From Swiss-Prot, chain A:
Binds to host ACE2. RBD also interacts with the N-linked glycan on 'Asn-90' of ACE2. Cleavage of S generates a polybasic C-terminal sequence on S1 that binds to host Neuropilin-1 (NRP1) and Neuropilin-2 (NRP2) receptors. Interacts with host integrin alpha-5/beta-1 (ITGA5:ITGB1) and with ACE2 in complex with integrin alpha-5/beta-1 (ITGA5:ITGB1). May interact via cytoplasmic c-terminus with M protein. May interact (via N-terminus) with host bilirubin and biliverdin, thereby preventing antibody binding to the SARS-CoV-2 spike NTD via an allosteric mechanism. Attaches the virion to the cell membrane by interacting with host receptor, initiating the infection. The major receptor is host ACE2. When S2/S2' has been cleaved, binding to the receptor triggers direct fusion at the cell membrane. When S2/S2' has not been cleaved, binding to the receptor results in internalization of the virus by endocytosis using host TFRC and GRM2 and leading to fusion of the virion membrane with the host endosomal membrane. Alternatively, may use NRP1/NRP2 and integrin as entry receptors. The lineage of its organism: Viruses, Riboviria, Orthornavirae, Pisuviricota, Pisoniviricetes. This is Spike protein S1. Changing residue 47 to H: In strain: A23.1. Glycans are attached at residues 37, 50. It comes from Severe acute respiratory syndrome coronavirus 2. It comes from the Viruses. The gene is S.
Length: 50, 50
């Protein structure tokens, strides 16, 4: 568990090594569009993700 | 291993306060650097022992 009660430290089901599991990676899709009448091309931004 | 052979004197049981003993792990979960409040069976602090 963690502060948000989320999994952060994991006992290896087998040997005695220490495992770390994070949930699925994601992001926030934000689009940068001009006017529909003016143009049709869309550039997309990814929120806080390298 | 049977009925007593008398000679059983009665010592006076002196009482001492258990300061901070009797605390254990209530769950088999792993939390890192938190402050968790729980409701469970415990020794009261500074309670007299026999
Ligand atoms: C394109 O459509 C927009 C939306 O109202 C408006 O600027 C106008 O109707 C059009 N612009 C032109 C034809 O320059
Ligand atoms: C332990 O606690 C009380 C006061 O806290 C003490 O006077 C006494 O010796 C003990 N209690 C009992 C019931 O023996």
């Amino acid at each position: 568990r963690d502060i948000a009660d989320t999994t952060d430290a994991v006992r290896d089901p087998q040997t005695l090594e220490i495992l770390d599991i994070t949930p699925c990676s994601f992001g926030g899709v934000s689009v940068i569009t001009p006017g529909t009448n003016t143009s049709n091309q869309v550039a997309v931004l990814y929120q806080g993700v390298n | 291993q049977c009925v007593n052979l008398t000679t059983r004197t009665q010592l006076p049981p002196a009482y001492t306060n258990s300061f901070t003993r009797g605390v254990y792990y209530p769950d088999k979960v792993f939390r890192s650097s938190v402050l968790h409040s729980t409701q469970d069976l415990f020794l009261p602090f500074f309670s007299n022992v026999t």
